[PDB]
Amino acid sequence: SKTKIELKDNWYHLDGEKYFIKAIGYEIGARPGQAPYEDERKDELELMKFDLENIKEGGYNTIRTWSQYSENQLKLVQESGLKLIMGIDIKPEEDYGDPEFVKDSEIELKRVLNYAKKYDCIITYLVINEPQTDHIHSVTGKAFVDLMNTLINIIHKGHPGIPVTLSANAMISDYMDESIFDVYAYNCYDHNEGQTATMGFKDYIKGLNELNGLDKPFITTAFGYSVSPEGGNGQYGSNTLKQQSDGLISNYRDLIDAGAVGMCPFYYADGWWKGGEKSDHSLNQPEEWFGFWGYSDLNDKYGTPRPVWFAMRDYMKGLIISPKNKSIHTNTKIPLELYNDKDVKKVVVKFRDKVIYSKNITSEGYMADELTIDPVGIEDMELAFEFYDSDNKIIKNESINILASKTAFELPELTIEVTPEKDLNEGKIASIKTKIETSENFTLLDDLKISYNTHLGWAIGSQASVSISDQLDKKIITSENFFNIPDNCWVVNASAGISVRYGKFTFKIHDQKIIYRGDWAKEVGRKL
Ligand SMILES: OC[C@H]1O[C@@H](O[C@@H]2[C@@H](O)[C@H](O[C@@H]3[C@@H](O)[C@H](O)O[C@H](CO)[C@H]3O)O[C@H](CO)[C@H]2O)[C@H](O)[C@@H](O)[C@@H]1O
Ligand SMILES: OC[C@H]1O[C@@H](O)[C@H](O)[C@@H](O)[C@@H]1O
């Protein structure tokens, strides 16, 4: 009598009902003094009970993991009521083409499935975490793609009806074909650099979903901020607790706006192990301070929640999927899509302090309806949503900003032409020629940003800020920027973008090219 999972209209459905995955990343075996990949493996059931209870009280309906649970650990999750997105420990730096590696991975996965298939709390498998561009280049995309297929197929037979995808960072694996998987997924971070500086976070991830083809559900397997005392660069590491909390909420809205119907904020609690020494909480390792919970000292096995925990719990009470923030509408009818928890009994939408939508909610979960708006010409509109509880008291406010008209209209447009256009082998030097078709009434703000992300490990590559002050009054605004191509660049994401404003509506216009060195990515690269 197990949960039927159906993927359609780019949503997960459980037992016929659309189901927004409100997950959180969760790693057991990562208390101070512990390292989950090196220590003798323990079930840690007492600490899991504490954690699973905390996570239910934090508002989540799902956990997301990196490493397979034992049967004992799975049964506890099963009995908790939470859903599980279970990662499999398939070492990313290993040779995917090595028959011993393949066989060990297959034997291990089959061992897991043999009991895991009894536990219907599992709603997705993640078959690998974070394969690096250069490594794939080195062992070949075919080795990679063949391994993914092998494991996908073993899961489809061993635990039927459960979707399979992977954990892949959007900043380094933008180029990758994800069409072999059942759902599209990225780890998504907003550090306002490279792709996220040009396109902005919303538009970057949405672009990838469009390139993917808008034909499967899309989820995020990670996002968030580190509150390390120091270390990192820009917004990576070294955030305040307030920055962390405000950042998760900005991320949550943005990624919904990119089409996500499942969310795995990163993550439950700090892992001191992650910067190298598990017994020490290093002041300058961003990676050891990503938790929504932190530990006081080496002996603290429990920890306490940081402000982000409470902001997230509050934010998740009522989710707005449509309309989307920074969306453009040319109809008077706007799709409304909500995912309410059981405490939301009424939703109101206001424009300029006037009710345009009111509805008593009698059942939790997904609901669709339509908003009627009445824009004059091209009208920027802050849509003020209000969620109320059973006592008619507001428990959440959220704005959705739209740009609306009853009639089709012109936006300013940014396109790029990139050289080499199609094959990096054709020269040692690149160019990005940007062209902005302006539109009066739309103000271009600040600097044009250019990114030539050559994908060398985590490094962003060259960027450039170009002033367009001297050109603001022209219909067509141009720029040409040059970049040296590293010999070990196998793929590049070349992009450009600028901020635009219409009344109080601010957004970005941008364009993007993904360009490969040779035919190395015939198998692994996205086919359009
Ligand atoms: O089980 C698979 C794999 O796990 C690795 O350890 C993982 C980390 O890779 C992971 O890293 C996070 C990213 O997935 C996410 O996108 O961003 C955050 C912030 O930058 C990263 O920390 O974190 C989890 C949880 O601590 C770890 O379990 C192993 O290193 C690897 O050997 C193993 O195959
Ligand atoms: O410096 C390396 C780090 O850079 C960040 O942008 C990534 O999100 C991290 O996962 C990575 O380990």
Keywords:
binds a molecule of 3 linked components (BGC-BGC-BGC); endo-1; Labilibaculum antarcticum; six-stranded parallel beta sheet; 528 residues; hydrolase; alpha/beta; GH157; 3(4)-beta-glucanase; Immunoglobulin-like; binds beta-D-glucopyranose
Give, in spatial order, the strands making up the sheet with the most strands.
Answer: 8-7-6-5-4-11
Largest sheet: 6 strands, parallel
Ligands present: a molecule of 3 linked components (BGC-BGC-BGC), beta-D-glucopyranose
The CATH architecture name of the largest domain reads Alpha-Beta Barrel
CATH homologous superfamily annotation of the largest domain = Glycosidases
The assigned structural class equals alpha/beta
Q: What characteristic shape results from the CA principal axes?
A: globular
Radius of gyration: 23 Å
Protein name: Glycoside hydrolase family 2 catalytic domain-containing protein
Organism: Labilibaculum antarcticum
InterPro entries: GH
Can you describe this structure?
This is Glycoside hydrolase family 2 catalytic domain-containing protein. The structure is a monomer. With 528 residues, the protein is of the alpha/beta class. The chain folds into three domains: 21-318, TIM Barrel; 320-404, Immunoglobulin-like (Sandwich), CATH 2.60.40; 413-516, Immunoglobulin-like (Sandwich), CATH 2.60.40. Helices cover 20% and strands 33% of the residues. The strands form eight sheets. A six-stranded parallel β-sheet has the order 8-7-6-5-4-11. Strands 15-21-20-17-18 form a five-stranded mixed β-sheet, with no helix packed on it. A four-stranded antiparallel β-sheet has the order 25-24-27-28. The two termini are 40 Å apart.
